[PDB]
Structure 1
């Protein structure tokens, strides 16, 4: 969130989750941002297909 109630990010590269808690996606998909601060710098938490997980936000671009 940070400066709003809704956060959307578009993926530009494919990311495969190494851990069961890690998120997985391909390039070209809108992801919902839940928390920009998960307790680790550079890690973002989002939801995709009812699943929540952390991951380096470099595989997606935030509209704002």
Structure 2
């Protein structure tokens, strides 16, 4: 459904990843969106800081 054409998002809230596959981010971070479809609706996969993991899309707003 989604098509990663090089999408990017900004975090509106910080989030601490408890899991390793879970991305720990601050607010104001431009994340490189990898996949919106992680198999689950609500979790996006993004790469930030060299880490590509999943996070709930409720913490971010998309830029591109």
- TM class by shorter chain equals 0.7 to 0.9
1:26-56 CA-partner distances (Å, limit 9, x unpaired):
1111011101001111110000121110110
**Distance change (3 Å), C-alpha of 1:28 and 1:4:** same
Please identify runs of 4+ aligned residues in structure 1 that moved more than 6 A.
Answer: none
Instruction: Indicate the RMSD between aligned Cα atoms, in angstroms.
Output: 1.8
- The normalised TM-score by structure 2 is 0.86
Mind listing any 5+ residue stretches in structure 1 that lack a counterpart?
none
SS at match of 1:47: strand
**Structure 1 length-normalised TM:** 0.86
List runs of 5+ in structure 2 lacking aligned partners: none
